[PDB]
Amino acid sequence: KRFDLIIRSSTVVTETTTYRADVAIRNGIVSAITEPGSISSDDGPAIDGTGLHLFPGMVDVHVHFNEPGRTEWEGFASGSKSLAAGGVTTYFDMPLNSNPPTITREELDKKRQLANEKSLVDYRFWGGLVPGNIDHLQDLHDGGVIGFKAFMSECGTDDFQFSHDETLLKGMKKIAALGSILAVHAESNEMVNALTTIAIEEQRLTVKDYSEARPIVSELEAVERILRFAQLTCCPIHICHVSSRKVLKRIKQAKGEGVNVSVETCPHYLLFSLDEFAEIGYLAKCAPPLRERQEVEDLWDGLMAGEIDLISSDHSPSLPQMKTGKTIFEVWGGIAGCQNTLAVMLTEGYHKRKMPLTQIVQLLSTEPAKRFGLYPQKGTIQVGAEASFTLIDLNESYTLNASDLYYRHPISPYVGQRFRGKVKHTICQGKHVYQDH
Amino acid sequence: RFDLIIRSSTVVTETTTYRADVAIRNGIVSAITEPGSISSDDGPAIDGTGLHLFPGMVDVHVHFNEPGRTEWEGFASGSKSLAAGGVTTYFDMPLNSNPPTITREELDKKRQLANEKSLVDYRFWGGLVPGNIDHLQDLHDGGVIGFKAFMSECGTDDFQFSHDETLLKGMKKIAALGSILAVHAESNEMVNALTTIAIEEQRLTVKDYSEARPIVSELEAVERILRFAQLTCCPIHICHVSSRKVLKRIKQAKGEGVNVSVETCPHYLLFSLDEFAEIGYLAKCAPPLRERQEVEDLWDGLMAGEIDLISSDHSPSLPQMKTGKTIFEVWGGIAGCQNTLAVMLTEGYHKRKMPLTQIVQLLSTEPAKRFGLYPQKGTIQVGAEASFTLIDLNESYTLNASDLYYRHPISPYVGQRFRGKVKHTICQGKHVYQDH
Ligand SMILES: [Zn+2]
Ligand SMILES: [Zn+2]
């Protein structure tokens, strides 16, 4: 026992390269990387990783585990259980649906302790920016939040209020002075509910109608607005779940001009179109809505061309009764998918569309860690860095069924999907945290 | 036989120049002929030898402030100034007038007040405020040329700015009426958060006012209105744009299909931030004047074709209204609708070698095209309205208060050296202004 654990016989895949090696863990950090078989068989406990690929532990910057207050939607226990099954070793819990929201330093501390008790993998926390809490932002940053999250349009439960233009500007001035970053749900509030009201009036209750009631142009307006505020405030900004390449091109234009902006998408915008929205029905309702097939196809072209900074789940679960309603406008929208993010990426990106695995690491691990100041500690397989990684058999086929899910409620639009590439092991900070079977 | 004949001048239009005599009958053009074709005793004549005949300028943005705040300007001392600037048609803005043109009942009161007072032709801007979609179809059949809304907390008191809810409801209907919405494109919350900060920190220079309502505020607002345009299919007009960065954004939007027009005003083209502090207070406007590099950029855009039309944004107030402790204390606006052609001729044609045809285009013809009065206005052609102005191009002069026909003889253009004076203005066949 010279080392606490050793991964044997794998291919290490990184954000830039692949190579065969043994990786030796000591006190939760990587101690030694060696040529295959170089370390004595009597020098520590070993995971047999022959025929498997070792990715760095995925960093998911967008989850809603909803504990406390709406703990019965997910919880820190089942939430972090799901992530380990999907190869995720670090997650950033969003400040909302959690009730009260993570609005103050006190409300953070209560969430912090429930994560310290129930979470299987490592955690960080989003602070909340709402109309009231401009004095609380300083305190939240001292509480150690990785960033802040405001909403540009009304969403879900109305105890987390969306920010009007005055709130956004005052918060950003403070957040920039804090040396932090603000994430936004960029939809255009008044375009959204004006078009929704029209759609409910006219009995147009299809999946396409929902998509057009919160259209791409609405995403473009809110993105354009927030970029301009960012330019004034010099506040680093992150744009959550973009559905369309049209929006990515506008962010590219801003990046070229000098704006400190990142942009994410989510794997359901990569997997499902309006056709799949129709057939799955209510489980595939999200904000922003799913778009047409042409639009999904163009979004992959954006990803391939480096127009997306990172991928995150936007794991947004609810009580199974909330997913049933009158029509598409009645259903509480959001996708339960954080266990399957790596799976769809590997399946549709690597096997189907021939994206390199190096870019899967970059998008789901490395850039999430860089953008929030956790690099090279996280997002890497290197000497000195945190020993958080995941072993994947890249060629293992499986139909996902509800029995596989570790979500508090096993219901998903990904149920009945055929994947290829299965996580077999997940190691978080030295601790053997998940094994298949 | 002819009611009036303009003799021996050089005609200048939106595309060409030629030496001709122009014959006028019943308020329209009846013949255009080679010099001296018509005998001396076929009607009263005006000697335009040495001069150039431009079609009457059309100024789509004036505030004459009547009724309510008449003593600021008024329809008489407004149209008097316009004729002295070579302007034969104007559109009056609904704000500053008290109470503003919201209903048809407030419209027709302003309509027939201009029947008594107005020397030249007139059209009216309808108003769009918080909740008045009830009166929009009404105002359109009341013959308005378009509608106006503010995106900035400005006007006076109670021309309140239209937020996103109002803007989108308005545009939906304006599209269906088959007309057009003009906007004051400044970002409301960007404006009065940066204004508050600059007041407390004793930063009271004109550069500090300029940065309080910055170019990025214009950009944010223009962008927002362009998307709202795209959603609702409403034709749109961006008022007084101060920078080519804002124009560049509109050119991109034009390429993507958006029905936008954009204007700028002479003060943005003449006065910079150096000239702001030098003149001082009377150079305050919304958006503010920018740095010298920005004024030079704006010219490059104009020359490139990035501006659709020119208007004055004639925004007048009392002398004592241009008095305060600081630059923010003051009610801002520039009186200059007599000088619109004058500065254009001087700065563009003489100084920066812009062709005369292009100054007809931006000050007369495109104002006419954009709002549906072409080729009735904006032209010298047979059958068009006999509205033109005679100019001695090369004629130099200095402008002072005594020359101005405004209600209040105060303007930042006072003391400026112009080259290009208007000698005559004919409006609808009537000889409406003569210099000496
Ligand atoms: Zn979310
Ligand atoms: Zn104005």
Distances (CA, A) of B311 to B70, B97, B136: 21, 19, 24
Across-strand partners of B334?
Answer: B314
Q: Which of B163, B165, B224 sits opposite A225 (nearest CB)?
A: B224
Contacts of A229 in chain B (CB under 8 A): 190, 220
B128 C-alpha vs ligand 2 centroid, how far in Å? 14
Instruction: Give the domain range for residue B68.
Output: 55-372+392-418
Is B61 annotated for ligand binding?
Answer: yes
- Minimal CA separation from B189 to chain A, in Å: 6
Q: Does A223 touch chain B (CB under 8 A)?
A: no
Q: Name the experimental technique.
A: X-ray
Would the CB atoms of A232 and B190 count as touching at under 8 Å? yes
**Cα of A180 vs its chain's centroid, Å:** 19
On chain B, the residues whose CB falls within 8 A of the CB of A189 are 164
A194 touching B (Cβ < 8 Å): yes
Q: Which residues contact A136 (CB under 8 A, 6 or more apart)?
A: A103, A104, A105
B293 is written with which tokens?
A: 């590099």
CA distances for A11 relative to A57, A194, A265, A347, angstroms: 14, 53, 28, 19
User: Is the domain of A245 the same as that of A339?
Assistant: yes
Verify whether the Cβ–Cβ distance B164 to A191 is below 8 Å.
yes
Report how far ligand 1's centroid is from the alpha carbon of A21 (Å): 38
Q: Does B169 touch chain A (CB under 8 A)?
A: yes
**Minimal Cβ distance to A165: which of B189, B216, B227:** B189
Report the distance separating Cα A212 and Cα A434, nearest Å: 41
- Cα distance between residue A142 and residue A138, in whole Å: 6
Q: Looking at the CA of B154, which ligand is closest? A: 2
Report which of A117, A142, A114 is spatially closest to residue A127, judged by C-alpha positions.
A142
Alpha carbons within 13 A on the beta-carbon side of B129: 19
How far apart CA B123 and CA A305 sit, in angstroms, is: 53
**Distance of alpha carbon A31 from alpha carbon A3, whole angstroms:** 8
Interface test with B, best of A162, A165, A168 (most B CBs within 10 A): A165
Q: How many structural domains are present in chain B?
A: 2
Q: How far apart are CA B20 and CA B29, in angstroms?
A: 13
Nearest ligand to the CA of A98 is 1
- Together in a domain, A77 and A142: yes
Residue A428 identity (one-letter amino acid): C
Beta bridge partners of B279: none
- Nearest in space to B218 (alpha carbons), one of B196, B197, B248, B198: B248
Resolution in A: 2.6
Alpha-carbon distance of B237 to B184, in angstroms, equals: 9
Q: Which two tokens stand for residue A39?
A: 């370390």
Whether B329 and B432 share a structural domain: no
The alpha carbon torsion through B360, B362, B367, B372 (nearest 10 deg) reads 80
Closest chain A C-alpha to B212 CA, distance in angstroms:
11
Chain A contacts of B163, Cβ < 8 Å?
190
- Ligand located closest to A64 CA: 1
CB contact under 8 A, A221 and B219: no
Contacts of A306 (CB under 8 A, 6+ apart): none
Residue positions counted in chain A: 437
3-state secondary structure chain A: CCCCEEEEEEEEECCCCEEEEEEEEECCEEEEEECCCCCCCCCCCEEECCCCEEEECEEEEEECCCCCCCHHHCCHHHHHHHHHHCCEEEEEECCCCCCCCCCCHHHHHHHHHHHHHHCCCEEEEEEECCCCCCCCHHHHHHCCCCEEEEECCCCCCCCCCCCCHHHHHHHHHHHHHCCCCEEEECCCHHHHHHHHHHHHHCCCCCHHHHHHHCCHHHHHHHHHHHHHHHHHHCCCEEECCCCCHHHHHHHHHHHHHCCCEEEEECHHHHHCCHHHHHHHHHHHCCCCCCCCHHHHHHHHHHHHCCCCCEECCCECCCCCCCCCCCCCCCCCCCECCCCCHHHHHHHHHHHHCCCCHHHHHHHHHHHHHHHCCCCCCCCCCCCCCECCEEEEEEEEEEECCHHHCCCCCCCCCCCCCEEEEEEEEEEECCEEEEECC
Task: Retrieve residue A192's tokens.
Answer: 């959204």
Residue type, B73: E
CB pairs under 8 A between A and B: 59
Q: Say yes or no: A65 and A152 in one domain.
A: yes
> Distance between CA A407 and CA B61 in Å, rounded?
62
CATH number for position B49:
2.30.40.10
Place of tokens 């030629």: B18
Please check whether residue B162 touches A, CB under 8 A: no
**Cβ density class A166-193: b for 16+ within 10 Å, e for less:** ebbbbbbbbbbebebbbbbbbbbbbbbe
Alpha-carbon distance B325 to B209, whole Å?
14
Interface contact A169-B190, CB threshold 8 A: yes
Rounded distance between C-alpha atoms, residue B314 and residue B304, angstroms: 26
Rounded Cα gap, residues A242 and A245, in angstroms: 8
- A245-257 and A293-304 helices, crossing angle to 10°: 30
B220 touches chain A (CB under 8 A): yes
Rounded to 5 degrees, φ, ψ at A231 are -65, -40
Nearest-5° Cα angle at B196, B191 to B200: 150
Of the candidates A191, A217, A231, the beta carbon closest to that of B216 is on A231
Nearest ligand (C-alpha, residue A288): 1
Contact B168 A188 (CB under 8 A): no
Query: Is residue A62 domain-shared with residue A181, that is, in the same domain?
Result: yes
Q: Do B164 and A225 touch (CB under 8 A)?
A: no
**Is residue B148 annotated as involved in ligand binding?**
yes
In terms of Cβ atoms closer than 10 Å to its own Cβ (0-12, 13-18, 19+), residue B163 is middle
Give the chain B residue whose CA is nearest to the CA of A257.
B245
Residues 6+ apart with CB under 8 A from A437: none
B60 with B34, same domain? no
The answer to whether residues A76 and A67 touch, using CB atoms and an 8 Å cutoff, is yes
As a whole number of angstroms, the distance between CA A77 and CA A121 comes to 10
Are B16 and B77 in the same domain? no
| Phi-psi sector, B32: left (phi>0), alpha (psi -120 to 50), beta | beta
CA distance B264 to A1: 78
Residues A156 and A51 in one domain: no
SS3 letters across chain B: CCCEEEEEEEEECCCCEEEEEEEEECCEEEEEECCCCCCCCCCCEEECCCCEEEECEEEEEECCCCCCCHHHCCCHHHHHHHHCCCEEEEEECCCCCCCCCCCHHHHHHHHCHHHHHCCCEEEEEEECCCCCHHHHHHHHHCCCCEEEEECCCCCCCCCCCCCHHHHHHHHHHHHHHCCCEEEECCCHHHHHHHHHHHHHCCCCCHHHHHHHCCHHHHHHHHHHHHHHHHHHCCCEEECCCCCHHHHHHHHHHHHCCCCEEEEECHHHHHCCHHHHHHHCCCCCCCCCCCCHHHHHHHHHHHHHCCCCEECCCECCCCHHHHCCCCCCCCCCCECCCCCHHHHHHHHHHHHCCCCHHHHHHHHHHHHHHHHCCCCCCCCCCCCCECCEEEEEEEEEEECCHHHCCCCCCCCCCCCCEEEEEEEEEEECCEEEEECC
Prior bond of A288 cis (ω within 30°): yes
A69-75: list long-range contacts, CB under 8 Å, 24+ apart: A69/A97, A69/A98, A69/A99, A69/A100, A70/A97, A70/A98, A70/A99, A70/A157, A72/A319, A72/A408, A73/A97, A73/A317, A73/A318, A73/A319, A73/A408, A73/A409, A74/A315, A74/A317, A74/A407, A74/A408, A75/A118, A75/A408
Domain shared by B226 and B214, yes or no: yes
For residue B58, which of B332, B294, B363 has the smallest C-alpha distance? B363
Determine whether B393 is exposed, middle or buried from the number of CB atoms within 10 Å of its CB (0-12, 13-18, 19+): middle
- Determine the Cα–Cα distance for residues A102 and A110; give it in Å rounded to an integer: 9
A241 annotated as a binding-site residue: yes
State which residue of chain A sits closest to B245, comparing Cα positions.
A257
Nearest to B52, CA basis, from B349, B435, B389? B389
Residues contacting residue B251 through CB under 8 Å, at least 6 positions apart: B306
Neighbours of B125 (CB within 10 A): 24
With CB atoms and an 8 Å threshold, state whether B165 touches A190. Answer: yes
Q: Are residues A361 and A225 in the same domain?
A: yes
B229 to chain A: closest CA residue: A217
Q: At A254, list the tokens.
A: 């801003």
Q: Establish whether the linkage from the previous residue to B375 is cis, with ω within 30° of 0.
A: yes
Structure tokens at A421: 């590439």
* Candidates A170, A220, A228; nearest CB to B227: A220
Residue A244 forms contact with B (CB below 8 Å):
no
Same domain (yes/no): B273, B405 = yes
What CATH number is given to the structural domain containing B335? 3.20.20.140
Q: Going by C-beta distance under 8 Å and a sequence separation of 6 or more, which residues neighbour residue B142?
A: B104, B107, B108, B124, B126
Among the listed residues B61, B48, B3, B43, the one whose alpha carbon sits nearest the alpha carbon of residue B21: B48
A72 touches chain B (CB under 8 A): no
Partners of A246 on chain B (C-beta within 8 Å) are none
Q: Give the gap in angstroms from C-alpha B209 to the nearest C-alpha of chain A.
A: 15
Is B138 annotated in a binding site? The answer is: no
Q: Is B129 left (phi over 0), alpha (psi -120 to 50) or beta?
A: beta
Tell whether A269 and A356 lie within a shared domain. yes
Q: How far apart are CA B329 and CA B90, in angstroms?
A: 30
Residue B420: φ, ψ to 5°? 125, 95
Lookup: tokens for B411: 């303007």
